[PDB]
Structures are given as C-alpha cells and as structure tokens.
C-alpha cells in the first residue's frame, strides 16, 4: 500500500440517462479511431502510427492482476472500501511503468533508427497516446459509456475489417487490368462496363484470387444464424422468502462462457504453431522435430501441427477425411473442457449460485430448499459444455465455408453488441 | 437607519419603507428589552412568574362567573382580556410547557362560549389555530365541522368530518355530522 495523486475521471453522483451515454460512446469511439490513422513525425496494420502500443499493455496489466487475484496472493476482502481503491491505483501505477518500458524497448530496438531530441519526441508521442487511451477507457467505464472500452474497440476493429473486405476502393492491377478488392464494387463494375452478363456474373462470383459476392452472402447467413441462436436460454421459476409476493425468473442462457474458451483455444493453437515453426526453423531435421511436423508450402505436412490445421475449403475437407475427423472432434472437445474449466474457475459454479440464493433468500417455486445445489448441478455444467461445443461447431463452419472474417471475431462482436442492447432494454430507453 | 429612543429604551425604525421581516424582528427586540428592564435579577431562570398567573386566573374566574349569571356578552370580553394579558405581559423566556397549556385551556372555553353565542368566523379561526398548534382530538373536529356548515363551506366540511371519523371511528356525533353534510352537499350539487 502507498499514497499517490494520479489523473482519473470522476463518476457522476446520479445515474446518467440513455442519450448522453450513447453520445459519449460515439464520440469516444470516434476519437479512438482518428488517433490510430495519423502517423508519427520523427521516423524516416496499426504499425507505425500514433497507436503503436494499442490497448495490449492495458490488457496485459488487467490479465496479470486478474491472475494475481485468482491465485489469492493479494488477500482480496470486499468488506473494506480501501483495498478496492488500492487495487485500482495499483492497476494504474503498474500499467504506466510497463507502458513506459515497452515504449523504451520499441524505440531503442525498433526500425525507427539508432541515431536525441528526435528520440525524446518519439517517446513522448507514444507516452501521450497511451495515456489518452487509458483516460478514454476510464471515462467509458466510469459510467458515461454503455459498456467497457476494450470490447467496444475490438468490435470496432472487427466491423471495420468486415466492411473493408467488402466495399474496398483499392484497385489491384496485374496484367489483365484494374480489378477491385471490394465485393459489391466489383460486382457493379463488372456488370456495368464488361457488357457480357453471362460471363460477368460467373467471373465476379467465384474470384479465387480476391473477395467475391458468395462470401458476402455466406457471412450474412452466418450473422443471421448467430443472431437467431443467441436468444436461447433456460428459464426456471424463482420466488423470494424474506418478503412474500415476489415471484421471478432466472434465465440461463446458452452462450454461458461468453466467447472466452474459443479465444483461449485460438491463442494456444497460434502459440503452438509459432513454437513448432520456430523449432523447425532452428533445427532442419531431427527424429522428434520431423515426427511432430514437416513444414512445407507455409503449412506442415505429415505432422501433428498439420493435423490441427484448419480447413479452408471443401477441397481439403474431401481430400483427407481423417484429418477432418480428428480436427473437428479435437476442437469441439477442447472448447467443451475449456468451458467447464472456465465456469469452474470464474466463480460461476452451481455452488456459488446456490450460496447466493441462500444469501438473497431466493428459492424455487415448487421445490424445497435443500435441493437447489442438486438441481443446479443438473443445469449449469451441461449448459456450459454444450455452449462450448456449439461455439466450436460454429467456428468450424465459418472457417470451412470461408466467410470474410473468422467466426470467432463475428461471434465476439455480435455478443458484445447483444450485451449492450440487453442492458439498454432491461434499463429501458430509446 | 433606526433611531434609539431616549427614555423608553425601545428601538424604533425611522425609515420610510421596510419589509415585514425587519419589522417583526424589531418588535421582538422591543418586547425582549422591555421585559429585561422589568426583570431585575441578573441570572434569570425559566421558572414562571406568580403574580402574573394570579391576576390571569383572577380575570379568568371573573369571566367564567358570568355564565352562572347567564351573561353571555361580557363573559367573552372578560375571557378575551384574560387571554390578551396572558399573551402580552408574559416574557418570552418563560417556560414553554406552562405557557402553552394555559393558553390552550383558556382558548377552549373561549371557543365554546363564542360558538354558543353566535359569532362563527372568529370561532373557526381560533379552532384552526388550536388544531395547528398540535392538538388533534374529536373535541375539536366536531366543533370545526359545525362552524364550517354554519358559515356554508360544504366540501371542507366533508373533508374535516372524514378526517375526524378516521381518528375515533366509534364516535356517535361525527357520523351524524357526516350524514348531514352528505345531504347538504347532495342538495348543493343535485
């Protein structure tokens, strides 16, 4: 514990209405977006612009402190209103120094150049950018904004990528002529200027080299399917005991884990792929290194990393059915067990909910009081496992049909926006 | 500005126009200093006076005796003079719990006498003061509703009768007054 006087935005003494919340979300998003396109000065993807660091250091700070909380080394006690402020100020004081260290690393090692005032200005620019991003996250989180800042930024990046891969203006000219990188642009151009409709439709429909219209239809289909499969929930009747006459319902949604296990799975597969590639690069051939994977053209061959490789189209799907029959079950079981582990660790176990019912005095309508945990054991784990398996299935389908973006990203964006709408509708507003 | 008198030792306001707040505070300071001139002891105590209460009781008894003589005109004057004396010639720092109940009790007999005599608006106003000071009993609501129906205000009559019956539901005259005001108001509308 220590004393510190740091910059922080204050929370409103009253509840802020809906319209001001929406306007603040919009303006904060606009500022964060403009900040990321303007490049630095002294030098001679969001790489090389004012947003070099991004929010990743903030994610690392939050992650390491969440892990320190979970491992029970800080002795968290919600009974005091001082340890919360201490943890919150520790967040900021460690984030600032870690961000400073990352900035020093990237300026003394990055491709900006070894040769002093220029280096000072370069470190100051990044410092100020990261500081403003931190203040903006804090502002959006204190209550002025609909929800978190990080999830909003991630949904922004996903939606922007999905659009740019559809309505791109950048023309690619390789011998044959000017070709568009957008989908609808390409369709309208080849419909208007080519004047050979029967050939133009098929030429603008497949485009094995650049995005096309079939991909757009497929991603709209998967979006609508995800939006349909989101409202699923298990509802059971609950009644109170402290004050009588209060009857309620406790909804148990299907996507219980809320996109975490798919993120963990993607992260671990990416990490193991990088490690396998680096070790195959260091040692050309060895018994274990050749058995785990033989890299080729980069995709491994006759290796385990090759077996865990995703399927891009139906061609490779029908090519080797054994790879599919192992990979699908592998990813599904992984997401399922990750869902179970996450609901076990995140304090969302049926025991904790039964205890919360004991505190609040809530009880089932037509059931006794000694069997709440027994009934929750029959509802929560199956729901979590099935949600994980369904997320895995939808991810496999998206990666197979090859839409404009990976299924995980669309799922994350749709889930975040759905949470925003759910809060807005439960509160009640325009 | 404001002039300080010479022999009377009461502060007088000499300005042309003044608000009500300053006038009230000036009068209160006048009565305070006029009491301090009279009371000679340096360390005064909230203990009430004696001769003042004696003359007050004397006037009250002399007024009440007129009822036995069936003199209904001068008894009201006598009780009014007693109330005015007990309101004027008693310094403010005297005990509250002995200046309040005496006033309430004397005003009660004054209310009854004034209601029987034939004066009505004065009786109703005294009753509203007595009920505003913090005495809520069916010995007040019935008389107030009677005065209201006497000087012809029907809606407030029903309101007061219902407020009364909702504080002593077993009463016998409040229900009669409720029925009478109901008939009067049904005539007033229909």
């Amino acid at each position: 514990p220590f004393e510190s006087f740091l910059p922080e935005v204050i929370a409103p003494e009253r509840k802020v209405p809906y319209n001001q919340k929406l306007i603040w979300t919009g303006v904060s998003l606009l500022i964060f977006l403009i900040l990321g396109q303007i490049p630095l000065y002294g030098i001679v993807s969001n790489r090389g612009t004012l947003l070099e660091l991004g929010v990743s250091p903030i994610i690392t700070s939050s992650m390491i402190f969440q892990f320190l909380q979970g491992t029970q080394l800080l002795q968290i006690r919600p009974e005091s209103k001082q340890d919360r402020e201490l943890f919150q100020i520790a967040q900021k004081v460690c984030a600032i120094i870690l961000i400073l260290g990352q900035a020093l690393v990237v300026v003394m090692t990055g491709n900006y150049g070894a040769p002093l005032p220029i280096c000072l200005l370069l470190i100051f620019q990044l410092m100020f950018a990261s500081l403003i991003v931190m203040l903006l996250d804090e502002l959006l989180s204190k209550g002025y904004g609909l929800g978190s800042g990080i999830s909003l930024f991630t949904a922004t990046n996903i939606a922007e990528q999905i659009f740019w891969r559809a309505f791109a203006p950048t023309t690619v000219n390789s011998g044959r002529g000017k070709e568009f990188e957008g989908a609808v642009i390409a369709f309208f151009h080849l419909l208007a200027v080519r004047k050979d409709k029967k050939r133009a439709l098929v030429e603008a429909f497949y485009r094995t080299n650049l995005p096309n219209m079939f991909q757009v239809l497929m991603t709209v289909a998967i979006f609508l399917f995800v939006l349909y499969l989101q409202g699923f929930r298990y509802e059971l009747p609950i009644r109170s005991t402290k004050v009588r006459g209060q009857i309620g319902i406790y909804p148990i949604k299907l996507f219980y884990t809320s996109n975490t296990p798919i993120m963990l799975q993607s992260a671990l597969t990416s990490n193991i792929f990088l490690i396998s590639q680096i070790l195959f690069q260091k040692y050309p051939t060895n018994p274990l290194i050749r058995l785990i994977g033989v890299w080729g053209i980069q995709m491994a061959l006759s290796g385990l990393a090759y077996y865990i490789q995703p399927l891009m189209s139906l061609s490779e799907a029908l090519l080797d059915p054994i790879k599919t029959i192992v990979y699908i079950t592998f990813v599904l079981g992984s997401c399922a067990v990750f869902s179970k582990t996450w609901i076990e660790i995140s304090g969302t176990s049926p025991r904790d909910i039964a205890k919360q019912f004991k505190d609040q005095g809530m009880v089932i309508n037509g059931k006794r009081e000694t069997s709440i945990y027994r009934e929750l054991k029959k509802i929560i784990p199956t729901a979590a496992a099935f949600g994980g398996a369904t997320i895995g299935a939808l991810s496999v389908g998206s990666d197979l049909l090859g839409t404009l973006g990976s299924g995980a990203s669309i799922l994350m964006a749709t889930t975040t926006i759905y949470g925003y709408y759910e809060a807005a509708a439960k509160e009640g507003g325009f | 500005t404001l002039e300080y008198n010479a022999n009377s030792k009461l502060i007088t306001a000499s300005d042309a126009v003044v608000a009500l707040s300053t006038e009230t505070n000036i009068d209160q300071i006048n009565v305070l200093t006029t009491s301090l001139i009279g009371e000679t002891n340096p360390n005064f105590t909230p203990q009430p006076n004696e001769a003042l209460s004696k003359m007050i009781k004397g006037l009250f008894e002399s007024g009440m005796k007129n009822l036995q003589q069936k003199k209904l005109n001068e008894a009201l004057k006598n009780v009014s003079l007693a109330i005015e004396m007990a309101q004027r010639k008693r310094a403010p720092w005297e005990a509250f719990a002995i200046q309040l109940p005496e006033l309430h009790f004397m005003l009660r007999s004054k209310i009854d006498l004034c209601l029987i005599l034939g004066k009505h608006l004065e009786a109703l106003q005294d009753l509203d003061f007595l009920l505003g000071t913090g005495l809520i009993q069916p010995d007040v609501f019935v008389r107030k509703a009677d005065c209201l129906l006497k000087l012809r205000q029907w809606e407030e009559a029903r309101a007061t009768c219902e407020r009364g019956l909702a504080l002593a539901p077993e009463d016998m005259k409040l229900r009669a007054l409720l029925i009478e005001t109901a008939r009067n108001l049904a005539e007033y509308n229909g």
Binding site: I31, L35, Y41, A129 | -
Partner: protein, 32 residues
Amino acid sequence: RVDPLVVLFLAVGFIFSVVALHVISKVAGKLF
C-alpha cells in the same frame, strides 16, 4: 479531478499538434 470535456480538449489539441508538426516539416522542406 478531470471532466470529460477536459479529456476531449486534450486529445484534440494533441492530434492537431502532431498534424501541425507534420505540415510545418513539409512546408519547411519545400520552401527552404
């Protein structure tokens, strides 16, 4: 300690300062 308009004003001042720095460098390289 700080109000939202403070954060907005700081961010806008910063962005405009960087853009002014770029345009000053460019006009200086072009003129002299």
